[PDB]
Design a protein around this ligand. Structure first.
Ligand code: A1IFL
Ligand code: MG
Ligand code: MG
Ligand code: MG
Lengths: 211, 242, 244, 204, 250, 233, 241, 198
């Protein structure tokens, strides 16, 4: 379960930390965000290897663009390298759903959904993975453009927790990122183990569980 | 004529020797290695005053911890730099680490002898040697701060300091005396500027001469024209003192 | 090895000229003269047959005037065999353009591609250039009547009237003398013959030593016609212009 | 599935006294959905006519291809390709894609300019020539066309009589096939002039 | 190993000549005389069977060759060059025509195809031009009878009548006198035997002369009967016997 | 004479010589001196390294090819890189496929056949370097001398480069002494240093100048440079 | 097959084929480019050895690479077509993958890289062509002018000229172009270009074309009369003295 | 499938194209423009397989933009359609075909007449007064068969679409999130920005 949304205060990026092999839980302590450069984030959902290998390879290709053109790569052009790569492997069975989230002066704050089908879309709000629908549910019914950084961080966290709870194939912990003019800032790892009870008390929600 | 990969009676590759001659006609480049960093300086040498001088890029970044200066047929350097950058990034992709300055140099020198007309070995499709020498400079955890000279022969020496281009045999004799093991970065800066001034046709200012360095902390930084201008003014006042 | 026997057909002189191009131009200067003249209402192609006999069948004979399209023709000056190789790839480019776009090829486009092919034999491959110069007479609905010229160097230019092959200096002076922009096709035919008549290295200009083509837009249709004149029709037009 | 039954359409050709006719429907469909009522299936290269039924993309591509080939033919030979020769070109062209064929059922029709002899032929999709004197049929209602032609047709019909016979064959066959009709055109072909006629037929 | 001769061996000289093409014409000039005559209802091509040794069977060496049932070729110059050109000519008549249009190519086009191969040997890497000139005589439904000349350059021209080789200059002069546009095929076989008597030094009979005609269809030379449209080949080489009968009326 | 028959390696001279190969051989004599010698238990490489300036490094002359094999160079270093790289692969192919340490003898035959192909085909050039190969395989200590003509020779000791004849005359003399330095590595190296110092003239061998390698019974091919070699000066 | 090394080093360290390629450029008809404060101007001379041409269809000397970048050249005309086509394809390729038109430096750097490759590839001779490449970067108002030569070397110029008698007109520009105040107008920028050509062209109405490139893909070639005006004003500047 | 409509009137061609992009169970975007400008007077709308759709569109675009600079001239709508048909007809017999259907609406400045081409992924091309791709055609063709006239103004053309989109909003099972509407005429291409309630 991964999401990225755009608002007054830049971009919010939030991801779960669960790796599965069917109904086996492989890990609860996984990074699903690649920090490409101080102003570019990539999110990972789908085949674990496929995401990791090719988003690491994107990292290299972006660095090669800085050396060549003496200029930070655009989000548009970064998303389109991954997009064009993936498109060459179409039919072969690659599996990745990814958001390229970053700030350039030229573009402003920008999000690209790119998936292994070849689909490349600009937008303000994406949720990607088996948990996407659970996340959309909470996010779409609380989103405004005019949220505070603090409230937008919370909504992002609260929208991953939501999907961590219902979707059997999501959970572990929430990783939070904020993307501004000054780049990305990491807003920490939140173990669903302790987050759920702190939120249920404080928010008075999750009334369906006995606690 | 005769083969492009032919031996002279003195046991030397003609095309490689003739190549080193092209490199003597090139603009000067100097390197000085210290325990506080490595400094690269070049003579820009614009052919006309209408030529916008800071479009002359004869010092390039290879990675954050490696930069190189050139001298000779500078156009031949483009594909060498492309190979240096691709190699440094591709090393980073396969091992999650920075390529060693020495290993980077060894990869560039591996292009040098890939010339011929179908020479029985691999598939060296490149008509002639490169007409350009490189001063590759960098830092790594293993061997500290490093300066390397990469010739079109495929050999590459490590130097404490080295000049290439038109002024080199004059400049080299000067570095021989001036260099010691406990130079500061600041000293080596003044020293490069000083030796360029001596061996350049034109009077040395901040338009026809470019400085750069590589430090562990800050990586590889080309000095902008204002910073170099202040170091030329500093040099003149130290020379006018005694 | 082989290096000993390599002419090196694609190199520069110390002066910056291309040996093999220059010498090919020399080859073309000894070939029968070909003339293009563009009028307001059509284009004339005329050319002189270098060497003839009483016994050379003139009816089944085409050495200088070839149809590339239904809207484009060339006059040749140089090696006939080298010309047929290029004419044949030019005819194919024209059909590949018609198949792709369902429109007839614009004249400059075809001319550029043929000039591009020659240019290749000038920079890579180690083979001799084609000893061939073309006059292209064509119509399209963008520029109307167009007269181009191409040579072994791969270079092309457009013209109101032009000559290639033998005695071009002499021919170009005589056209520059009597050409006017308001000219009519029937005027152009007459100009084309007068010019050949005075640059010929032969006694008289007779019908059997001539090929002739006109690209007109017959006023009773609204479409472009190509006429490659038959022996009897060159013989007619020769008596009318007073050369008998 | 069956590339021969996606778009639908028919062609027939008939010989008469010093004349041939070739007719086709105008339907271009995508299964049940009719899409175009203007899609003509009968092309000409000089005085030689070619009808093509089947997958519509291939109909378009073969017409472009035989235009290309007959054009270069005329430039080199300095004359118009004759029916007999064009037949062989179609045959060899189809056989050349034996293991990836064009899903078509082509039909040649025209008069030999030298002999005056009316000529027709049809071909399977890999270029097996069928050269009957009487008539040639092709498309989704071939069966129907076979029974109309076999019953209606007699030899040595004058052009105006032939026109009735090929028109009644095509019409009455298309009105028994879901994938044919939506209009039709008939070419009557003689040594000198050629008359094209659009027919009035059921629009269902 | 490997053909490392990827560059032209025929290049323009400062005078604008192609050295190798001129030298090939010189080799064609040393060749034995061969000629061609076009009548109203046929064509005749003829040459001398210059036997290298009297022990050699001159019959086993076809200077005159069938290319298609209605086309024939003969040559002056280097016989090995001719032999491989006939081989390539017969096979290009099939691959570039008969396997596509299901009929034999017309004379001008087959000639066009021969010319092309000879041009490529003028320009392709690592080859010399062919050291022959060809005289090709043929018939096709739409162009009637024709006669073409093909040179080492690849150039070709159509002739009413011509000769190539040793005594071409004089053979051409003699054909100009005797040619008219009303000649019957027999009249032209007679003129060909006259013109070829001036070229031959020693014996002149059916066993030293090779002569073939393009004329009427020969149903008796077809091999099968029952298809009316097929009337047999127009090309016919004359027998040793047939030449001698026409020599006694010389 | 010589001017018309030295264009390329595909041309014999009228006396039956290959000049391009002899010219390549010449590049070796211009190279810095290196020595090899062996007992029954160990095999040594002593090489004199050569510096361009006092500001430059003394270029590395000894390359490791496997745990049990390596070689010193003299001539074009880039050619010793290509030939050592090919040896590394063959030592590697022997290990991976047959689980077998490549024999020094067979390493010799393989270098010979690689150098030879360049001497019989147009466009190529001979390798412009000489190599001394030391190994300890299943048949004990070995030393080889490689020549770009493709000639390889198993020896007790030898030397190649400039003034190499001094070290070679000394080994020719010391033969019965050093051959019997079994189970004593420090004494075989000393007799190696005392050999190479017979071919000096310019300078005395210093700390960052000398380069030594050893292989034997229970000693993996290991290269000693600098401070490490201070106890042999 | 053909991989013969045609560009090789001679004993004095010179590549004669690259040297001789420059000689073909000297022989080329002159071309000049001067960049103003807000514009760049390309001016190219037309020969007069053969005049009875069609000026509607004869290929003009300034080529559009994209809608915001142009390329004038001196040297072999046929060679220049191969560089232009390659540059025009890299323009579209760059838009497709970067979603942004080329910078003028990038397009120059590419053309320079192609010329370089043809100086150390078997079977090919260097391009007999130098280029001026001028235009404006996307959403940028700072004017750009760059030069490539057969060797493959490139660099930017306040103003520059290439081809026959470039020596003379470079001298002119070197004492008529102030870097402190570049031609502030489009008009006075076109004036300095025509002036610089009139040192070499020798009375040329129909022997001088001008093309003016402004920001945001605004490129226009001047007609005879428009240039013919600038000639008439410049010859009254001399005579009034 | 997605919605791809075109209708040619007196002096213009109008393309209308659904704004929905839907992977599986989630509508990912509700503002998608399923059209590329090929030349100043030629527009191409497209629907089909996830990746191929835009990859094909942007490839055609680049080729037409290249042709434009090289010849400094705009290809006829007929020429662009014939180029595009041929590209698809190759793709259909390649290892992995482009599964993309297109409408091309263009104004021919030489003929002074609008033109609408419908071309499926096989390379089937036809000129139509009105066209559609996917399930949409099952409703719109019989609708336009009734209400269409060849002499209609651009304004009438737009009412004729508003009638097609309402019918589709009524009877089709998919939420396609309304359409983006573009007009191609003598003056080039402009987007009707107020179709949300026109
Ligand atoms: C939110 O929606 C999350 N839902 C959880 C999860 C696990 O489904 C996943 O899509 C996650 C993506 C992350 C995982 C951590 C690394 C970064 C990517 N995917 C997996 O954890 C992945 C599941 C998966 C397997 C196979 C396929 O099709 C091939 C798709 C998804 N797990 C793995 O790949 C396991 C890793 C641990 O064993 N390995 C394999 O499946 C090995 N086989 C892979 C296929 O090829 C054969 C070998 O996270 C989203 C965001
Ligand atoms: Mg769960
Ligand atoms: Mg029906
Ligand atoms: Mg119905």
């Amino acid at each position: 379960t991964t999401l990225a949304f755009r608002f007054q205060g830049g971009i919010i990026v939030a991801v779960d930390s669960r790796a599965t092999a069917g109904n086996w839980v492989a890990s609860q302590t996984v990074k699903k965000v690649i920090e490409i450069n101080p102003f570019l984030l990539g999110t990972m959902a789908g085949g674990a290897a496929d995401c990791q290998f090719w988003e690491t390879w994107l990292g290299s290709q972006c660095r090669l663009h800085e050396l060549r053109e003496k200029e930070r790569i655009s989000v548009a052009a970064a998303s389109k390298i991954l997009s064009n790569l993936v498109y060459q492997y179409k039919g072969a069975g690659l599996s990745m759903g990814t958001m390229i989230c970053g700030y350039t002066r030229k573009e402003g704050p920008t999000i690209y959904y790119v998936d292994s089908d070849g689909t490349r879309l600009k937008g303000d709000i994406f949720c990607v993975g088996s948990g996407q629908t659970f996340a959309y549910g909470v996010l779409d019914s609380n989103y405004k453009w005019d949220l505070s950084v603090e409230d937008a961080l919370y909504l992002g966290k609260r929208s991953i927790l939501a999907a961590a709870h219902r979707d059997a194939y999501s959970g572990g912990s929430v990783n939070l990122y904020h993307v501004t003019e000054d780049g990305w800032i990491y807003h920490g790892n939140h173990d669903v183990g302790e987050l759920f009870w702190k939120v249920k008390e404080e928010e008075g929600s999750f009334n369906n569980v006995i606690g | 004529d005769r083969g492009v990969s032919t031996f002279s009676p003195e046991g030397r590759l003609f095309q490689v020797e003739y190549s080193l001659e092209a490199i003597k006609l090139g603009s000067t480049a100097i390197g000085i290695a210290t325990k506080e960093g490595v400094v690269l300086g070049v003579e820009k040498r614009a052919t006309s005053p209408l030529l916008e001088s800071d479009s002359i890029e004869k010092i390039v970044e290879i990675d954050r911890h490696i930069g190189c200066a050139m001298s000779g047929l500078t156009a031949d350097a483009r594909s060498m730099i492309e190979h240096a950058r691709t190699a440094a990034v591709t090393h980073n992709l396969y091992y999650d680490e920075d390529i060693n300055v020495e290993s980077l140099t060894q990869s560039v020198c591996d292009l040098a002898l890939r010339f011929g007309e179908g020479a029985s070995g691999e598939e060296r499709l490149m008509s002639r040697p490169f007409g350009v020498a490189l001063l590759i400079a960098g830092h790594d955890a293993d061997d500290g701060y490093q300066l390397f000279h990469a010739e079109p022969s495929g050999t590459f020496y490590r130097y404490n300091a080295k000049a290439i281009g038109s002024g080199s045999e004059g400049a080299q004799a000067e570095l021989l005396n001036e260099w010691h093991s406990s130079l500061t970065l600041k000293e080596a800066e003044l020293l490069v500027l000083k030796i360029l001034k001596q061996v350049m046709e034109e009077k040395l200012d901040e338009n026809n001469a470019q400085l750069s360095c590589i430090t562990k902390q800050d990586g590889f930084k080309i000095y902008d024209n204002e910073k170099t201008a202040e170091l030329i003014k500093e040099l003149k006042e130290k020379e006018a003192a005694e | 090895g082989s290096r000993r026997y390599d002419s090196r057909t694609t190199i520069f002189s110390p002066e910056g000229r291309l040996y093999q191009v220059e010498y090919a131009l020399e080859s073309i200067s000894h070939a029968g003269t070909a003339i293009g003249i563009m009028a307001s209402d059509g284009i004339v192609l005329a050319a002189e047959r270098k060497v003839t006999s009483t016994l050379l069948e003139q009816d089944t004979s085409t050495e200088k005037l070839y149809k590339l399209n239904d809207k484009i023709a060339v006059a040749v000056a140089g090696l006939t065999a080298d010309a047929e190789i290029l004419i044949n790839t030019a005819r194919i480019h024209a059909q590949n353009y018609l198949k792709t776009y369902n429109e007839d090829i614009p004249v400059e486009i075809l001319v550029r591609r043929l000039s591009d092919i020659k240019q290749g034999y000038t920079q890579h491959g180690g083979l001799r250039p084609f000893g061939v110069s073309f006059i292209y007479a064509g119509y399209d609905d963008r520029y109307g009547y167009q007269l181009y010229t191409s040579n072994p160097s791969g270079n092309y230019t457009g013209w109101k009237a032009i000559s290639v092959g033998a005695n071009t200096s002499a021919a170009q002076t005589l056209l520059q003398m009597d050409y006017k922009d308001d000219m009519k096709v029937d005027d152009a035919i007459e100009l084309a013959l007068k010019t050949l008549s005075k640059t010929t290295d032969s006694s008289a200009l007779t019908y059997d030593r001539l090929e002739f083509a006109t690209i007109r837009k017959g006023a009773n249709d609204g479409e472009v016609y190509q006429k490659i004149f038959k022996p009897q029709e060159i013989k007619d037009i020769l008596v009318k212009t007073g050369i008998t | 599935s069956d590339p021969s039954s996606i778009n639908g359409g028919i062609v027939v050709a008939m010989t008469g006294k010093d004349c041939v006719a070739i007719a086709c429907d105008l339907r271009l469909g995508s299964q049940s959905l009719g899409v175009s009522n203007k899609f003509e299936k009968i092309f000409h290269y000089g005085h030689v006519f070619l009808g093509i039924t089947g997958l519509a993309t291939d109909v378009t591509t073969l017409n472009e291809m035989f235009r290309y080939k007959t054009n270069l033919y005329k430039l080199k030979e300095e004359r118009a390709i004759e029916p007999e020769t064009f037949t062989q070109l179609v045959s060899s062209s189809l056989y050349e894609r034996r293991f990836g064929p064009y899903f078509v059922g082509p039909v040649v029709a025209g008069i030999n300019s030298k002999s005056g002899k009316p000529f027709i032929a049809g071909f399977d999709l890999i270029g097996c020539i069928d050269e009957a004197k009487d008539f040639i049929v092709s498309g989704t209602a071939s069966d129907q066309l076979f029974g109309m032609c076999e019953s209606l047709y007699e030899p040595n019909l004058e052009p105006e009589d032939l026109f009735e016979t090929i028109s009644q064959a095509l019409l009455n066959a298309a009105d028994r096939d879901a994938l044919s009709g939506w209009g039709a055109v008939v070419y009557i072909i003689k040594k000198d002039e050629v008359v094209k006629r659009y027919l009035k037929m059921r629009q269902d | 190993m490997t053909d490392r001769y990827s560059f032209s061996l025929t290049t323009f000289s400062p005078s604008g000549k192609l050295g190798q093409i001129d030298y090939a014409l010189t080799a064609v000039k040393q060749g034995v005389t061969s000629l061609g005559i076009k009548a109203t209802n046929g064509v005749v091509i003829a040459t001398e069977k210059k036997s290298s040794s009297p022990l050699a069977m001159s019959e086993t060496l076809s200077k005159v060759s069938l290319l298609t049932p209605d086309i024939g070729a003969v040559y002056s110059g280097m016989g090995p060059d001719y032999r491989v050109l006939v081989d390539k000519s017969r096979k290009v008549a099939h691959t570039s025509y008969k396997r596509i249009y299901g009929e034999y190519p017309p004379t001008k086009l087959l000639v066009s195809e021969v010319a092309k191969i000879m041009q490529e040997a003028t320009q392709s890497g690592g080859v010399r031009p062919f050291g022959v000139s060809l005289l090709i005589a043929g018939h096709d439904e739409f162009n009637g009878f024709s006669l073409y000349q093909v040179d080492p350059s690849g150039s070709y021209f159509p002739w009413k009548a011509t000769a190539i080789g040793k005594g071409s200059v004089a053979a051409k002069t003699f054909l100009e006198k005797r040619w008219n546009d009303e000649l019957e095929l027999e009249d032209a076989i007679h003129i060909a035997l006259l013109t070829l008597k001036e070229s031959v030094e020693g014996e002149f009979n059916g066993d030293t002369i090779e002569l073939a005609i393009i004329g009427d269809e020969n149903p008796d030379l077809l091999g099968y009967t029952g298809i009316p449209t097929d009337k047999g080949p127009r090309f016919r080489k004359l027998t040793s016997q047939e030449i001698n009968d026409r020599l006694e009326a010389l | 004479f010589r001017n018309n028959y030295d264009g390329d390696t595909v041309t014999f001279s009228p006396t039956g010589r290959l000049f391009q190969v002899e010219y390549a051989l010449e590049a070796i004599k211009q190279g810095s001196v290196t020595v090899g010698l062996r007992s029954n238990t160990h095999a040594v490489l002593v090489a004199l390294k050569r510096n361009a300036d006092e500001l430059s490094s003394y270029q590395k002359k000894i390359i490791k090819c496997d745990e049990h094999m390596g070689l010193s160079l003299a001539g074009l270093a880039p050619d010793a890189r290509v030939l050592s790289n090919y040896l590394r692969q063959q030592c590697n192919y022997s290990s991976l496929v047959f689980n077998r340490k490549l024999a020094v003898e067979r390493a010799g035959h393989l270098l010979c056949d690689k150098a030879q192909k360049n001497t019989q085909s147009y466009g190529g050039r001979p390798y412009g370097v000489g190599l001394l190969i030391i190994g300890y395989d299943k048949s004990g200590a070995h030393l080889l001398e490689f020549q770009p003509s493709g000639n390889v020779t198993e020896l007790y000791g030898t030397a190649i480069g400039a003034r190499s004849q001094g070290a070679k005359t000394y080994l020719e003399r010391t033969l019965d002494t050093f051959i019997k330095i079994d189970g004593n590595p420090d004494e075989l190296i000393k007799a190696g240093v005392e050999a190479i110092s017979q071919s000096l003239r310019d300078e005395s061998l210093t700390v960052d100048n000398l380069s030594i390698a050893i292989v034997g019974k229970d000693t993996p091919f290991t290269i000693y440079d600098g401070e490490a070699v201070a106890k042999y000066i | 097959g053909y991989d013969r090394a045609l560009s090789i080093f001679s004993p004095d360290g010179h590549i004669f084929q690259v040297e001789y390629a420059l000689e073909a450029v000297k022989r080329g008809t002159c071309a000049v480019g001067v960049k103003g404060k807000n514009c760049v101007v390309l001016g190219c001379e037309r020969r007069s050895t053969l005049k009875l041409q069609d000026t509607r269809i004869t290929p003009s000397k300034v080529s559009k690479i994209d809608s915001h970048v142009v390329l004038s050249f001196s040297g072999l005309n046929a060679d220049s077509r191969i560089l232009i086509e390659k540059a025009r394809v890299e323009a579209q390729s760059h838009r497709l993958t970067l979603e942004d038109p080329v910078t003028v430096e990038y397009l120059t750097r590419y053309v320079a890289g192609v010329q370089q490759r043809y100086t150390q590839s078997g079977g090919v001779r260097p391009f007999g062509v130098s280029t001026l490449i001028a235009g404006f970067d996307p959403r940028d108002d700072e004017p750009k002018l760059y030069q490539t030569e057969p060797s493959g070397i490139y660099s930017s110029w306040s103003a520059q000229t290439i081809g026959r008698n470039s020596k003379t007109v470079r001298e002119f520009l070197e004492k008529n172009y102030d870097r402190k105040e570049p031609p502030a107008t489009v008009e006075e920028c076109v004036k300095l270009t025509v002036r610089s050509l009139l040192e070499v062209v020798q009375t040329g109405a129909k022997n001088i074309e001008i093309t003016v490139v402004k920001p945001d893909s605004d490129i226009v070639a001047l007609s005879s009369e428009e240039i013919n005006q600038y000639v008439t004003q410049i010859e009254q500047e001399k005579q009034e003295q | 499938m997605d919605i791809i409509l075109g209708i040619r009137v007196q002096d213009s061609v109008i393309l209308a194209s659904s704004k929905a992009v839907t992977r599986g169970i989630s509508v990912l975007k509700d503002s998608d423009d399923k059209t590329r400008q090929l030349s100043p007077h030629t527009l191409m709308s497209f629907a089909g397989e996830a990746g191929d759709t835009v990859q094909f569109a942007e490839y055609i675009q680049a080729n037409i933009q290249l042709y434009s600079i090289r010849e400094d001239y705009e290809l006829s709508p007929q020429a662009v359609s014939s180029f595009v048909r041929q590209e698809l007809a190759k793709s259909i017999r390649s290892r992995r075909p482009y599964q993309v259907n297109v409408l091309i609406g263009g104004y021919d400045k030489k003929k002074n007449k609008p033109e609408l081409y419908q071309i499926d992924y096989l390379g089937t091309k036809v000129e139509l007064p009105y066209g559609a791709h996917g399930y949409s055609g099952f409703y719109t063709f019989s609708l336009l068969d009734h209400h269409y006239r060849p002499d209609m103004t651009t304004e009438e053309g737009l009412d004729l679409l508003k009638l097609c989109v309402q019918e589709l909003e009524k009877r089709m099972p998919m939420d396609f999130k309304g359409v983006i509407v573009k007009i191609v005429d003598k003056d080039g291409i402009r987007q009707v920005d107020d179709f949300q309630a026109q």
